[PDB]
């Protein structure tokens, strides 16, 4: 099933990257009641907050991420969105390795490194989610951008598993 395995890997890599990039770009992470500058229903993201109703509707303001070493570090890490961006970067590199595999079949480690990138991307994604939620804590709901991030994590982990299976079966088949 190597053809189908590679198909799943490529499609999944693209899906994970697309979902994560959209999530990092779009601004529907959180539905709360803040202000775009009275408090009204808003819809914040990683960078901008926007009004969902009333006169200033459609108006978005850069999130004042900033207004205790631990609080400072959390606020810094959440302000720069280090971890969502790092997960996007790693998904990009994983996709590059998956693409490069076919054009260079001599070396095996290419697809293995794809798998490792995807797994690492998932881990960064988790750290991002935790940091984001924790930083918010310092009524509400989660939007579709948040769930795009979550689905990116799941798909990334699946694609990592499939990639490692491709590498394993290549070495198992060739070695014996």
């Amino acid at each position: 099933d190597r053809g189908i395995q590679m198909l799943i890997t490529t499609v999944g890599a693209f899906a994970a990257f697309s979902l994560m990039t959209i999530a990092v770009g779009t601004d529907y992470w959180l539905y709360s009641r803040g202000v775009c500058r009275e408090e009204v229903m808003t819809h914040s993201g990683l960078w901008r907050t926007c009004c969902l109703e009333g006169a200033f509707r459609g108006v978005c303001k850069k999130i004042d991420h900033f207004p205790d070493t631990a609080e400072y570090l959390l606020r810094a890490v959440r302000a720069s969105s280090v971890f969502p961006i790092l997960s996007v970067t790693l998904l990009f590199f994983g996709g590059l390795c998956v693409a490069a595999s076919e054009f260079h079949r001599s070396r095996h480690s290419v697809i293995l490194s794809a798998g490792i990138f995807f797994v690492s991307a998932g881990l960064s994604n988790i750290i991002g989610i935790i940091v984001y939620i924790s930083a918010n804590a310092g009524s509400y709901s989660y939007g579709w951008s948040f769930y795009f991030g979550a689905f990116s994590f799941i798909i990334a982990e699946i694609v990592g598993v499939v990639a490692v299976h491709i590498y394993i079966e290549k070495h198992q088949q060739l070695r014996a």
């Binding site: 798998g115 797994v119 998932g122 881990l123 988790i126 939620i133 994590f153 982990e157």
Partner: protein, 137 residues
């Protein structure tokens, strides 16, 4: 208020439950990865089973032997111990502050776990039939 069907989840916030599920997947995948590229049977399915059983503080048919497998296993064990103790402790808090304000627990505020249980048994029987038919043809 009358207890809700899934009220047994109340001691931990929804985000904790969601992150438990993600951590579970991440642990299972890393255990699988470190085990297959290590000098010295943790496939992905067995990795998922090991991790599930570890979180439920139940049996393991197999434990990791490598240093990397044991690091993964050790941190997952520690996480499990903290999270389960936190569940029990916070449930004790909710029930003690409600008694301060027979108080035996009623079937109604654990009914959700029974529904999930019987749903799982139904699903298990369905999967058994599917796998059987697949292996037949």
């Amino acid at each position: 208020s009358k207890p809700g069907v899934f009220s047994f989840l109340d001691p931990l916030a929804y985000e904790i439950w969601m992150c438990i599920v993600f951590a579970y997947i991440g642990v299972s995948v890393v255990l699988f990865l470190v085990s297959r590229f290590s000098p010295y049977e943790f496939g992905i399915f067995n990795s998922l089973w090991f991790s599930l059983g570890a979180f439920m503080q139940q049996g393991c048919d197999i434990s990791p032997r490598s240093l990397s497998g044991r690091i993964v296993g050790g941190v997952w064990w520690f996480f499990t111990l903290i999270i389960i103790s936190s569940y029990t402790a916070n449930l004790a808090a909710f029930l003690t502050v409600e008694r301060m304000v027979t108080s035996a627990l009623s079937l109604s505020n654990v009914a959700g776990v029974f529904y999930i249980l019987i749903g799982g048994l139904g699903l298990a029987m369905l999967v058994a039939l599917i796998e059987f038919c697949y292996k037949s043809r």
